[PDB]
Design a protein around this ligand. Structure first.
Ligand SMILES: N[C@@H](CCCC(=O)N[C@@H](CS)C(=O)NCC(=O)O)C(=O)O
Ligand SMILES: [Fe+2]
Length: 329
């Protein structure tokens, strides 16, 4: 009785090459998906996702409680005042099932100018001990650059789809400064599954995480093959089918702002499923000072009555609001 959502599979391959015509055909597909339910799967993206889930499972399953406190964000561990974003997000057995590990740009090192200035939302990543987790940091840092690569190609597709030159977004999405992050989220199988860890939607649907719009320009998501996501449409909440060979793509509210809502940030929520699974989002965030002037591809002159908003401001307020609305993850 819940209908299936329209989530097209788009071969994003041409976005890596120089066939400008082929790129326009991919852009049209992005345009259609963005104006409809606001989700699509990127296929032929070139990333080894099987290796990704394997390396990630090895980490989630071998990290100990000790290590988690030692890596924990400030919300779980008051000693770690600089860890607002990056580090470990603990489960609370009996109360909160989900747990995760977030890391930012590998280039945010101690000598980075934004780290030196202590600019909000910039942090140096924390990692487990190499001997307990051999290869993990290097795997994870490589993965950041692989998915960064996929996201630049996708940003060229969205730029072309909106009537712009292909670097419109991508020129603000740079290795030395992107606020992009990876979150390795573990959703556990639990028996018994704690009721306090299950939320209930107004329509009676059991959830693991409530309705929201994403805090990003776009979101580039790998998940396990366990159906869980629902997107709200004019026909109501519809199920997004799982596909663990592709990346699920959608826009965040930053894109909605820029396009004066021509590409909406789709409202979605995460159904409660009692299954051991992974949700591995890459939040495509720009630079702290990145400002794109808002426009409207539905108006003849392209003008919008929205004001410019720097990415850093959007991100910092956005992530705080998401915590307040939907709880500390
Ligand atoms: N710490 C991250 C941002 C994490 C944002 C977040 O909490 N996303 C929610 C909604 S997209 C989540 O993904 N909830 C669950 C789920 O399965 O999606 C980094 O600093 O940028
Ligand atoms: Fe989301």
């Amino acid at each position: 009785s819940v209908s299936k959502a329209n989530v097209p599979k788009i071969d994003v391959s041409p976005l890596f090459g120089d066939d400008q015509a082929a790129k326009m055909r991919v852009a049209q597909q992005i345009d259609a998906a963005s104006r409809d339910t606001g989700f699509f799967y990127a296929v032929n993206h070139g990333i080894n996702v099987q290796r990704l889930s394997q390396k990630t499972k090895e980490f989630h399953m071998s990290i100990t409680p000790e290590e988690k406190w030692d890596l924990a964000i400030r919300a779980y561990n008051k000693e770690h005042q600089d860890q607002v974003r990056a580090g470990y997000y603990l489960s609370i057995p009996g109360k909160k099932a989900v747990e995760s590990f977030c890391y930012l740009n590998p280039n945010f090192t101690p000598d980075h100018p934004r780290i030196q200035a202590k600019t909000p939302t910039h942090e140096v990543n924390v990692w487990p001990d190499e001997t307990k987790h051999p290869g993990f940091q290097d795997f994870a840092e490589q993965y950041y650059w692989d998915v960064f690569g996929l996201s630049s190609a996708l940003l060229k597709g969205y730029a072309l789809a909106l009537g712009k030159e292909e670097n419109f977004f991508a020129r603000h999405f740079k290795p030395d400064d992107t606020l992009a992050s990876v979150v390795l989220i573990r959703y556990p199988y639990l028996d018994p599954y704690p009721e306090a860890a299950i939320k209930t939607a107004a329509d009676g649907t059991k959830l693991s995480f409530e309705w929201h719009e994403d805090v990003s320009l776009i979101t580039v998501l790998y998940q396990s093959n366990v159906q869980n996501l629902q997107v709200e449409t004019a026909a109501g909440y519809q199920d997004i089918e799982a596909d663990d060979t592709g990346y699920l793509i959608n826009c965040g509210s930053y894109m909605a702002h820029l396009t004066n809502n021509y590409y909406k940030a789709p409202i979605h929520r995460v159904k409660w499923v009692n299954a051991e699974r992974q949700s591995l989002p890459f939040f495509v965030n720009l630079g702290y000072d990145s400002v794109i002037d808002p426009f409207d591809p539905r108006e003849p002159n392209g003008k919008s009555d929205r004001e410019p908003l720097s990415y850093g401001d959007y991100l910092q307020n956005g992530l705080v609001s998401l915590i307040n609305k939907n709880g500390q993850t």
